[PDB]
Write a protein that binds this DNA or RNA. Structure first.
Lengths: 72, 180
DNA sequence: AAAAAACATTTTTTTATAG
DNA sequence: CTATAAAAAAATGTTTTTT
């Protein structure tokens, strides 16, 4: 307010905005809704990434393969 | 007095309790940026409830993006369905919120070259370095950014109620220092 | 000087905000 | 980029022990 100051707990608390969401650490099977269930690409689609990722990071992959030589 | 900081950003830290291989995580997801030469993590930038996160091969991602606390808890809950549905164990343990950010408009010009005089024991203002005035508050420890126009960034706190006190406290000071 | 196990930093990610 | 803060763990980057 503009006169006598703001009342502490008449505003929302983070702790009411946390207790609104599920806490189950094992059974996180309450936020599945198709779109989420679609962030996991198949075989033909995952195979294309491994193929492309290898090329972009064939830079990285040689120093790591030479790190296998310093370790032998 | 009549305004209350809008949460524009919340950081969420979370443990999944397993040293999981990154290589695989990325090659199974729509949002899959693994550049181990760059950052040592994977980047999944989910749509609802809108985040970005950052998964670590030890199992403790950095979920940054939430607009609230409904979001930030679920944001990090949604990587716990993916990493699960791929091939890893990995639970959802210790949802800690490291940072919350704030903002608003007090709707009037605010002088800063004079705030640095009175409350300059808390302050550091270099004009042509950064147009904002940095307020280091102690109780509670939430850092305000006070811009010329009258807009304040209130990044710092881990509880929402904290941030809101930092606006209320600094207000009669944002009122005293002005361009009439 | 030298090889070593000790601390400290540069990197990234989000978000609004203004020189 | 300048600036706030906040996690995190690969990684190089400093100061300081122990050879």
């Amino acid at each position: 307010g503009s006169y006598c100051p703001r009342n502490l707990h008449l505003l929302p608390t983070t702790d009411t905005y946390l207790s609104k969401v599920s806490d189950d650490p094992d059974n996180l099977e309450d936020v599945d809704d198709e779109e989420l269930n679609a962030h996991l690409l198949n075989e033909e689609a995952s195979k294309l990434k491994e193929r492309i990722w290898i090329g972009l990071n064939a830079d990285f992959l040689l120093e790591q393969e030479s790190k296998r030589l310093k370790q032998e | 007095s009549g305004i209350v900081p809008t949460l524009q950003n919340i950081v969420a830290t979370v443990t999944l309790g397993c040293r999981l291989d990154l290589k695989t995580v990325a090659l199974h997801a729509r949002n899959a940026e693994y550049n181990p030469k760059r950052f040592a993590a994977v980047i999944m930038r989910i749509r609802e409830p809108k985040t970005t996160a950052l998964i670590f091969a030890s199992g403790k991602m950095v979920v940054t993006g939430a607009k609230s606390e409904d979001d930030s808890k679920l944001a990090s809950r949604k990587y716990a369905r993916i990493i699960q549905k791929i091939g890893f164990a990995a639970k959802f343990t210790d949802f800690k919120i490291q940072n919350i950010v704030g903002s608003c408009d007090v709707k009037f010009p605010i002088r800063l070259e004079g705030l640095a005089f009175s409350h300059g024991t808390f302050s550091s203002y270099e004009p042509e370095l950064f147009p904002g005035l940095i307020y280091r508050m102690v109780k509670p420890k939430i850092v305000l950014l006070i811009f010329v126009s009258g807009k304040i960034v209130l990044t710092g706190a881990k509880q929402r109620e904290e941030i809101y006190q930092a606006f209320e406290a600094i207000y009669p000071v944002l009122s005293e220092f002005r361009k009439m």
